[PDB]
Amino acid sequence: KPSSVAFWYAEQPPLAELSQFDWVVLEPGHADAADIAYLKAQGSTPFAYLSVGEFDHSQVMDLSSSVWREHLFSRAAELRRQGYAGLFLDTLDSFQLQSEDRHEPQRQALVSLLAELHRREPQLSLFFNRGFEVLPELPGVASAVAVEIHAGWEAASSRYRTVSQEDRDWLQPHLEALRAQGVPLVAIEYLPPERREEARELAARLVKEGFIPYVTTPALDTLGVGSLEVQPRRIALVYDPREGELESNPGHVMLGGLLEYLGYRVDYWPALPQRPLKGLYAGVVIWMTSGPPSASDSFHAWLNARIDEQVPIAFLAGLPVDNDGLLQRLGMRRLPRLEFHDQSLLGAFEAPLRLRPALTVTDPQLTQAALVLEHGGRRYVPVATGTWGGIALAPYLVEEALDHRRWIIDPFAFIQRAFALPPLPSPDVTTENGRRVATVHIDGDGFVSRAEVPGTPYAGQQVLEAFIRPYPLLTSVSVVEGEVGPKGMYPHLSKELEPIARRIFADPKVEVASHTFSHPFFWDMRREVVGTRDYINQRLTTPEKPVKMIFWSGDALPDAETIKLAYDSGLPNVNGGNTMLTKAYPSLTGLYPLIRPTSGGVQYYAPIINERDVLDTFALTDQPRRLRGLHLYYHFYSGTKQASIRAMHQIYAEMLRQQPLSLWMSDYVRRLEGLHCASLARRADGRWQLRGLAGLRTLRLDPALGWPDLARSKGVAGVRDLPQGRYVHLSRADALLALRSSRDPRPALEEANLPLTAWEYRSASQVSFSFAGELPLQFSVRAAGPCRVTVAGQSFQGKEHDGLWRFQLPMKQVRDGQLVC
């Protein structure tokens, strides 16, 4: 029996958010096979809309007609074959539009139609929309019945209308009876997107009245409020393609990574979506500096639609608005000495405020200036916020110089203020089981180069002996077929080079990746993606250790079709961007995003760029905010010179001093997948519900939300309260996070060196747990009394240090260990 239900009849269903709901009704034809399978993998049950009484300007069909009956029976079979778990049966009372003479005939034809559909397809759950005239003769057939109770939509007048008490009285006996037969009742209510607080109240009311509510819009094209409410965890970033493609837009390059860090999926848009963003987007960033698009009327309409639904909008850098009425709605108008500024928003973050846009505030009730400059006696306002969002216009956004930029606004404070962002458990990929994450991946370039060392071995052997073998970090290694293979550019060296590659790929700390055939410096694509995959799999490694990833060469900006080709070939991908921060130039403007979404799929940028700059980037992305894990990225050419070799050894040493949790790049990318896809929802019992996390298992909990409540959580193992964040550790993707205002004194995981695969409280003092990785397990527990772990008939007493109980077990995996304190 369902605990929550959502309806989405539009294209581009937001899959992770909808998967928060037990049942999801879709419009088949606006959804594809991949959509259905994703919902199911997340635990949701997908239903398909099917109109029974009418054909779609509708045609009331003859329910006794053999052509129509068999059409619907056929459609049911197809939809089942396509993966739907049920049907949402609509227009079940449309027969009453006929003459009273034909009413009983058609009713009886409908009872038999539905009985026969049920008989033929017993595996399909049948979710009726009303049907009160036929349900009494279909006992046990309906899994649920919907009713469109308090807030309705009147299609004839195109308006939202309170439901008459007369209408409820008519419904009341029918619903009473259904409740007595144990049939779930789904109340489908309609409120405009801006009246979201009312929707929350109505949903709570309908639950107490015994319904499963879903409060939405008449087009069913919004993420509505149900018995749970999805937390808007996306931010949109709109750019002007005339000014450049996404990958060079300054908002993507300088802000995308900060929005990811703050806790959000970032969707990038150059036709803008013509549906409500309310309930799905926490805000919209606009970063356009050449004015409105040529289709300016539609653009202005779109902006006004967000204002009207109260989705906040932040205009950064430029103000692409040629519409005084729009500006008037925001209390602004088009029209140097410093008259005023809000130092919480600018001037105290990186760059100081230095004097160097014809825009002012007309209504301080609507817009609060953060910066007021006076020139020629007029007051200009280039930075401001209000309930509608904000503006932060050049040259008071970023200080710019050739090769260097610094923030003038505090970007975090501005976005938080403009969008009124609430505190979140933010998905976080920098830290796992309380430890900073470490990856090491190697581009194959220079494998064939000879090291400037005695013996002049190949760079491939040098990296194997100097770096891979001596250090205990899992490493993801690529080669270029154009270097090492018979069909490449060194066909007579392949006989000496392939054996080295085979030895590397056979090391137990190594996983295999491809670095293409010809190492394109600037992106035959099937030859580069598929052919070198096949070359490596066949000649350099075994069936049990295949290529796991493609590492892009060169500028690492393939097109959408190439990315899709890589996915179609079983190869997740990594590289690109230019995340680099140095003590010389430590501005956070140097942080790229992790994620580059395309129509061909997601490209993951290199978390930290390749080849002192790197040791600095590690430190500046660790503190005061931990923006990145320890991500060592280099080329085989780095093993050709004593000085590069010396530098490498110093990087490895700093990484190991931090005692990270080591991951292969292919496993790390499943964490980044969660970064991109995660959804958060707030249940009525107050717990946070998670979907779409994939391999991600850390939430950075905003201290305003308190501490994990380990009595009421599911899949939450502990917390580590560090300067950079309150890291909550998850033992599964479908976790439920209960919160309390004080730290839970029951035994909690503090840190561990291996991935965590289970953690369940048997009691306030006993935990069953499981870990699996590549090193002997080390972990520590925060608890009062002494702690002991029993595994496979053996007991280990915890060693105490400063409130923690530390454990070192001589095993790389633990299945259902027992912790008692």
Numbering used by the authors: 27 to 82, 106 to 197, 199 to 320, 324 to 388, 396 to 416, 421 to 587, 615 to 702, 717 to 926
Task: Give the exact sentences the study uses for this entry.
A major biofilm matrix determinant of Pseudomonas aeruginosa is the partially deacetylated α-1,4 linked N-acetylgalactosamine polymer, Pel. Once in the periplasm, the large 948-residue protein PelA modifies Pel using its two enzymatic domains. PelA's deacetylase domain selectively removes acetyl groups from the polysaccharide, rendering Pel cationic, while its glycoside hydrolase (GH) family 166 (GH166) domain hydrolyzes Pel. The hydrolase activity is required for the generation of the cell-free form of the polysaccharide, which is important for the biomechanical properties of the biofilm and P. aeruginosa virulence.
Herein, we present the crystal structure of PelA from Pseudomonas thermotolerans (PtPelA) and show that the protein has a unique four-domain structure. Diffraction data were collected for selenomethionyl-incorporated (SeMet) PtPelA at the National Synchrotron Light Source-II to 2.1 Å, and the structure was solved using the single-wavelength anomalous diffraction method. Structural analysis of PtPelA reveals four distinct domains that align well with the AF2 model of PaPelA (PaPelAAF2; 1.6 Å RMSD over 816 α-carbons). Upon analysis of the PtPelA structure, we found that residues 293 to 498 form a mixed α/β domain with 12 β-strands. In our crystal structure, we were unable to model residues 588 to 614 and 703 to 719. Modeling of these residues by AF2 in PaPelAAF2 suggests that these unstructured loops are important for forming a 23 Å-deep, 44 Å-long binding groove. PtPelA also contains a 14-stranded β-rich region comprised of two distinct regions (residues 793–937). Combined, this suggests that the β-rich domain could provide structural stability to PtPelA and facilitate carbohydrate binding. When submitting the structure of PtPelA to the DALI server, only structures of the isolated hydrolase or deacetylase domains of enzymes were identified. These results suggest that the domain organization in the full-length structure of PtPelA is unique with respect to experimentally solved structures. Using sequence analysis and enzymatic assays, we found that PtPelA and its homologs define a new class of carbohydrate esterases, CE21, with distant homology to the CE4 and CE18 families.
